[PDB]
Amino acid sequence: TVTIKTPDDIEKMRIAGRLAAEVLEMIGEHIKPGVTTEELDRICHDYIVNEQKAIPAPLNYKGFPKSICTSINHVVCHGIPNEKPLKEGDILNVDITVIKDGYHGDTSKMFLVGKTPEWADRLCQITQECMYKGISVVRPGAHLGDIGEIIQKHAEKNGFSVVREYCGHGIGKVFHEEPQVLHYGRAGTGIELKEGMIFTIEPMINQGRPETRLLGDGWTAITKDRKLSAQWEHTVLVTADGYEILTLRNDETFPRTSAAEFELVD
Amino acid sequence: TVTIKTPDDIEKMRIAGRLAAEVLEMIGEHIKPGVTTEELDRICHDYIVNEQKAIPAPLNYKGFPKSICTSINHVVCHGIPNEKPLKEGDILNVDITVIKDGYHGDTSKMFLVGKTPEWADRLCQITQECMYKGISVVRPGAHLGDIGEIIQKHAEKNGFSVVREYCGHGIGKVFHEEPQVLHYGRAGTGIELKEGMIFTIEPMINQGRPETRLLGDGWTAITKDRKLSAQWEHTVLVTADGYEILTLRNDETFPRTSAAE
Amino acid sequence: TVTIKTPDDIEKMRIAGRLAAEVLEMIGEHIKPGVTTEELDRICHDYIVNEQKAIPAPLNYKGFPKSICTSINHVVCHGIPNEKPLKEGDILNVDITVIKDGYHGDTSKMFLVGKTPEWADRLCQITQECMYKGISVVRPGAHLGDIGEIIQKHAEKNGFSVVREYCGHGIGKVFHEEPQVLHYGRAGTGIELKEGMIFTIEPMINQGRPETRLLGDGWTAITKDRKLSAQWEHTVLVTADGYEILTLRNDETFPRTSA
Amino acid sequence: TVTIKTPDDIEKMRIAGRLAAEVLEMIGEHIKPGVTTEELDRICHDYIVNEQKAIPAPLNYKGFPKSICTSINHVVCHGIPNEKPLKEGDILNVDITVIKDGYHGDTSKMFLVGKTPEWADRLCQITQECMYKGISVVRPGAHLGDIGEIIQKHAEKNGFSVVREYCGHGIGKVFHEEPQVLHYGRAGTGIELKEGMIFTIEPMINQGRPETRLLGDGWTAITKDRKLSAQWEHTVLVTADGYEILTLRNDETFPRTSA
Ligand code: MET
Ligand code: MET
Ligand code: MET
Ligand code: MET
Ligand SMILES: [Mn+2]
Ligand SMILES: [Mn+2]
Ligand SMILES: [Mn+2]
Ligand SMILES: [Mn+2]
Ligand SMILES: [Mn+2]
Ligand SMILES: [Mn+2]
Ligand SMILES: [Mn+2]
Ligand SMILES: [Mn+2]
Ligand SMILES: [Mn+2]
Ligand SMILES: [Mn+2]
Ligand SMILES: [Mn+2]
Ligand SMILES: [Mn+2]
Ligand SMILES: [Mn+2]
Question: What is the crossing angle of helices B8-28 and B37-46, to 10°?
Answer: 140
Q: How far is CA A1 from the centre of its chain?
A: 23
Strand A212-214 and strand A204-206: the pairing is: unpaired
Closest listed ligand to the CA of D145: 17
Q: Using CB atoms, pick whichever of C148, C167, C210 lies closest to residue B259.
A: C210
For residue D50, the number of C-alpha atoms closer than 13 Å in the C-beta half-sphere is 6
Please provide residue D220's backbone torsions phi and psi, each rounded to the nearest 5 degrees.
-70, 115
Radius of gyration over every alpha carbon of chain D, rounded to an integer in angstroms = 17
Spatial contact of A221 and A166, defined as CB atoms under 8 Å apart:
yes
Taking the C-alpha atoms of residue B17 and residue B97, their distance in angstroms, rounded to an integer, is: 9
Spatial contact of C237 and C244, defined as CB atoms under 8 Å apart:
yes
Taking the C-alpha atoms of residue C92 and residue C60, their distance in angstroms, rounded to an integer, is: 22
Spatial contact of C94 and C24, defined as CB atoms under 8 Å apart:
yes
- Residues with Cβ < 8 Å from A145, sequence gap 6 or more? A182, A185, A186, A187, A188, A189, A190
Cβ neighbours of A71 in B, within 8 Å: none
Taking the C-alpha atoms of residue D213 and residue A263, their distance in angstroms, rounded to an integer, is: 123
Point out which residues pair with B143 in neighbouring strands: B192
Q: How many CB atoms lie within 10 A of CB C241?
A: 12
Burial C17-39 (b: 16+ CB within 10 A, else e): bbbbbbbbebbeeebeeeeebee
Spatial contact of C191 and C144, defined as CB atoms under 8 Å apart:
yes
Q: What 3-state class would DSSP assign to A102?
A: coil
- Residues within 8 A of C (CB atoms), B 163-202 only: 194-195
Q: What 3-state class would DSSP assign to C197?
A: coil
Taking the C-alpha atoms of residue A130 and residue A162, their distance in angstroms, rounded to an integer, is: 10
Spatial contact of B79 and B37, defined as CB atoms under 8 Å apart:
yes
Q: How far is CA D168 from the centre of its chain?
A: 8
Taking the C-alpha atoms of residue A222 and residue B205, their distance in angstroms, rounded to an integer, is: 38
Please provide residue D71's backbone torsions phi and psi, each rounded to the nearest 5 degrees.
-115, 120
From A107's Cα to the closest Cα of chain B, the distance in A is 26
Work out the burial of residue B48: count CB atoms within 10 Å of its CB; fewer than 13 is exposed, 13-18 middle, 19 or more buried. buried
What is the maximum span of chain A, computed from C-alpha positions, in angstroms? 53
Q: Say which amino acid occupies A206.
A: N
Strand B229-231 and strand A229-231: the pairing is: unpaired
Tell me the C-alpha to C-alpha distance, in Å, between residue C238 and each of B30, C193, C258.
60, 7, 10
Q: Say which amino acid occupies C35.
A: V
Q: What 3-state class would DSSP assign to A195?
A: coil
Q: How many CB atoms lie within 10 A of CB C213?
A: 13
Residues placed in the known binding site of C: 73, 75, 78, 95, 106, 143, 169, 176, 192, 202, 229, 233
Closest listed ligand to the CA of C199: 8
Report which protein residue has its CA nearest ligand 4's atom 5.
D95
Taking the C-alpha atoms of residue A95 and residue B166, their distance in angstroms, rounded to an integer, is: 52
- In chain C, the N- to C-terminal Cα span, in Å, equals 28
Work out the burial of residue A31: count CB atoms within 10 Å of its CB; fewer than 13 is exposed, 13-18 middle, 19 or more buried. middle
Ligand 3 contact, B232 CB (< 6 A)? no
Taking the C-alpha atoms of residue D226 and residue B70, their distance in angstroms, rounded to an integer, is: 73
Cβ neighbours of B53 in A, within 8 Å: 215-216
Domains of chain B: 1-261 (3.90.230.10)
Cβ distance B26 to A216 less than 8 Å, yes or no, reads no
Tell me the C-alpha to C-alpha distance, in Å, between residue B41 and each of A46, A223, B37, B86.
37, 22, 6, 13
Ligand 4 contact, D66 CB (< 6 A)? no
Spatial contact of A56 and A140, defined as CB atoms under 8 Å apart:
no
Q: How many CB atoms lie within 10 A of CB B143?
A: 19
Please provide residue D136's backbone torsions phi and psi, each rounded to the nearest 5 degrees.
-60, -20
Q: Which residues surround ligand 8, an ion (CB under 5 A)?
A: C 106, 200, 202
Taking the C-alpha atoms of residue B196 and residue B240, their distance in angstroms, rounded to an integer, is: 8
Element (H, E) at B40: helix B37-46
Q: Say which amino acid occupies C37.
A: T
User: Could you identify the atom of ligand 1 that is nearest to the CA of residue A66?
Assistant: 1
Cβ neighbours of B194 in C, within 8 Å: 189
Cβ neighbours of C155 in D, within 8 Å: none
Spatial contact of B58 and B138, defined as CB atoms under 8 Å apart:
no
Element (H, E) at A177: strand A177-181
Ligand 1 contact, A97 CB (< 6 A)? yes
DSSP-assigned letter for residue D50: I
Residues placed in the known binding site of A for Mn(2+): 73, 75, 95, 106, 143, 169, 192, 202, 229, 233
Burial D152-164 (b: 16+ CB within 10 A, else e): bbbbeebebbbbb
Taking the C-alpha atoms of residue A248 and residue A254, their distance in angstroms, rounded to an integer, is: 9
Question: Ligand 3 centroid to B18 CA: how many Å?
Answer: 17
For residue A13, the number of C-alpha atoms closer than 13 Å in the C-beta half-sphere is 27
DSSP-derived secondary structure for B115-147? S--HHHHHHHHHHHHHHHHHHHT-STT-BHHHH
User: Could you identify the atom of ligand 3 that is nearest to the CA of residue B66?
Assistant: 1
Ligand 2 contact, C196 CB (< 6 A)? no
Report yes or no: D153 at the C interface, CB cutoff 8 Å: no
Q: Using CB atoms, pick whichever of B26, B29, B51 lies closest to residue A215.
A: B51
Report yes or no: B250 at the C interface, CB cutoff 8 Å: no
Q: Percent helix, strand and coil across chain D, each rounded to 5?
A: 30, 25, 45
Is B192 annotated to bind ligand? Answer: yes
Please provide residue C84's backbone torsions phi and psi, each rounded to the nearest 5 degrees.
-70, 135
Strand A204-206 and strand A161-162: the pairing is: antiparallel
Q: Using CB atoms, pick whichever of C145, C166, C210 lies closest to residue B3.
A: C166
Report which protein residue has its CA nearest ligand 4's atom 1.
D58
Residue of B nearest to D191 (CA): B188
Report which protein residue has its CA nearest ligand 3's atom 3.
B58
Report which protein residue has its CA nearest ligand 3's atom 1.
B58
Spatial contact of B96 and B108, defined as CB atoms under 8 Å apart:
yes
Tell me the C-alpha to C-alpha distance, in Å, between residue B97 and each of A4, B136, B143, D73.
57, 22, 26, 68
Q: How many CB atoms lie within 10 A of CB C245?
A: 23
Cβ neighbours of A222 in B, within 8 Å: 51
Cβ distance C153 to D187 less than 8 Å, yes or no, reads no
For residue A132, the number of C-alpha atoms closer than 13 Å in the C-beta half-sphere is 15
Point out which residues pair with C100 in neighbouring strands: C103
Beta-strand (E) ranges in chain B? 2-3, 55-56, 69-72, 75-77, 91-100, 103-112, 161-162, 168-170, 177-181, 198-201, 204-206, 212-214, 221-223, 229-231, 234-238, 243-245
Burial A206-241 (b: 16+ CB within 10 A, else e): bbbebebeebeeebbbbbebbbbbbbbbbbbbbbee
Residue of B nearest to A83 (CA): B50
Taking the C-alpha atoms of residue A232 and residue A127, their distance in angstroms, rounded to an integer, is: 7
Report which protein residue has its CA nearest ligand 2's atom 8.
B1
Cβ neighbours of D188 in C, within 8 Å: 188
Is B195 annotated to bind ligand? Answer: no
Taking the C-alpha atoms of residue C204 and residue B1, their distance in angstroms, rounded to an integer, is: 9
Residue B140: closest CA among B240, B234, B236, B235: B240
From B233's Cα to the closest Cα of chain D, the distance in A is 29
Tell me the C-alpha to C-alpha distance, in Å, between residue C70 and each of C24, C67, C82, C219, C226.
12, 10, 9, 11, 17
Q: How many CB atoms lie within 10 A of CB D91?
A: 22
Residue of B nearest to A218 (CA): B51
Residue D246: closest CA among D4, D13, D27, D57: D13
Taking the C-alpha atoms of residue D57 and residue D49, their distance in angstroms, rounded to an integer, is: 11
Question: Which bin fits A186, alpha (ψ -120 to 50), beta or left (φ > 0)?
Answer: beta
Q: How far is CA D242 from the centre of its chain?
A: 20
